[PDB]
Amino acid sequence: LPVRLTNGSSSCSGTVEVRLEASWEPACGALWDSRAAEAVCRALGCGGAEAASQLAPPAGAPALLCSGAEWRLCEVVEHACRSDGRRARVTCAENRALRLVDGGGACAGRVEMLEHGEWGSVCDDTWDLEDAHVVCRQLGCGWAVQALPGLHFTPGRGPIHRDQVNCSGAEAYLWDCPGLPGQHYCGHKEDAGVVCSEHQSWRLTGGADRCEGQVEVHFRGVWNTVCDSEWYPSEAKVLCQSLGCGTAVERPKGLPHSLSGRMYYSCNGEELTLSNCSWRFNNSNLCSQSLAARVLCSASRGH
Numbered sequence: 678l679p680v681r682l683t684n685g686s687s688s689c690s691g692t693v694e695v696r697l698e699a700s701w702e703p704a705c706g707a708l709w710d711s712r713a714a715e716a717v718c719r720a721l722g723c724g725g726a727e728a729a730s731q732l733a734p735p736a737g738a739p740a741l742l743c744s745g746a747e748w749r750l751c752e753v754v755e756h757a758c759r760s761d762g763r764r765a766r767v768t769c770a771e772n773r774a775l776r777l778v779d780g781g782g783a784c785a786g787r788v789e790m791l792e793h794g795e796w797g798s799v800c801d802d803t804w805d806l807e808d809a810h811v812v813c814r815q816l817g818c819g820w821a822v823q824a825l826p827g828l829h830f831t832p833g834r835g836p837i838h839r840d841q842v843n844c845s846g847a848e849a850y851l852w853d854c855p856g857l858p859g860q861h862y863c864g865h866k867e868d869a870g871v872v873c874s875e876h877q878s879w880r881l882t883g884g885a886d887r888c889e890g891q892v893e894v895h896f897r898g899v900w901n902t903v904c905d906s907e908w909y910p911s912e913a914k915v916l917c918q919s920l921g922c923g924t925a926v927e928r929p930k931g932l933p934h935s936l937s938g939r940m941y942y943s944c945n946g947e948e949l950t951l952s953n954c955s956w957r958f959n960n961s962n963l964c965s966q967s968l969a970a971r972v973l974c975s976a977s978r979g980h
């Protein structure tokens with residue numbers, strides 16, 4: 678009012694935008710000194726400015742001119758910069774962020790939060806699906822499957838930003854929820870975790886050991902089968918390598934699809950995991966007459 682921060686980590690971070698009579702336009706990358714960064718961060722109510730950056734996107738645009746480090750001394754100009762040029766970005770002192778660590782891939786792991794330039798963990802006391810649902814939506818992983826307690830994933834280090842969290846469910850961020858700070862009540866043994874809908878975990882059931890059997894995948898909070906139509910050595914090489922059982926040896930004939938859903942994959946061969954490949958979940962055109970794909974790796978007792 679009349680400044681805001683969009684497409685960033687929080688409401689106190691991201692690309693700078695200025696309000697006009699027509700619509701909100703991004704601020705100019707040039708003419709963006711640290712004086713204007715302080716004035717904008719302080720006016721929004723986000724404390725001081727930690728760092729100012731200039732990002733490039735893949736009539737003219739407005740700019741923010743300030744004679745001092747205050748909002749009263751700042752002035753907006755209508756046209757004084759090239760339109761399709763580098764924009765202005767900023768991270769204030771009150772900026773917060775969120776990350777999941779040690780969870781065998783993206784959209785899962787230990788819930789870590791950023792507060793005043795320090796990555797800290799959240800306690801498992803009063804941790805439920807209502808708190809996990811807020812975490813999965815802000816990151817872009819859909820809904821929450823399981824709100825895990827401590828010791829499921831590796832415990833964190835450093836500070837503990839929350840000893841108790843009680844989200845209603847509709848909050849945009851985890852920091853907006855009512856809670857209690859780090860008062861030495863909880864410890865790193867109780868570091869909370871989460872499993873979101875978009876996370877992908879794999880295993881091989883049916884065979885002699887862990888690196889042999891039916892290719893199963895945990896997507897959308899349910900175990901699913903893999904289509905044998907597009908299951909060639911390129912896909913099998915990525916699977917046996919990610920699980921850690923060497924190269925692929927054989928791809929036996931599958932059984933009918935007997936789980937919640939069906940998964941499709943199309944790898945080049947050099948991927949680190951099957952989630953990095955091109956995939957489509959529950960596609961009737963690609964998967965119909967197919968069977969549940971299988972694989973036999975090198976490290977198994979069967980080979």
Ligand SMILES: *[C@@H]1O[C@H](CO)[C@@H](O)[C@H](O)[C@H]1NC(C)=O
Pocket residue numbers: 843844845846
């Ligand atoms: C936790 O949040 C719910 C609303 O989701 C509220 O009814 C309840 O009183 C809160 N717990 C405490 C201890 O205030």
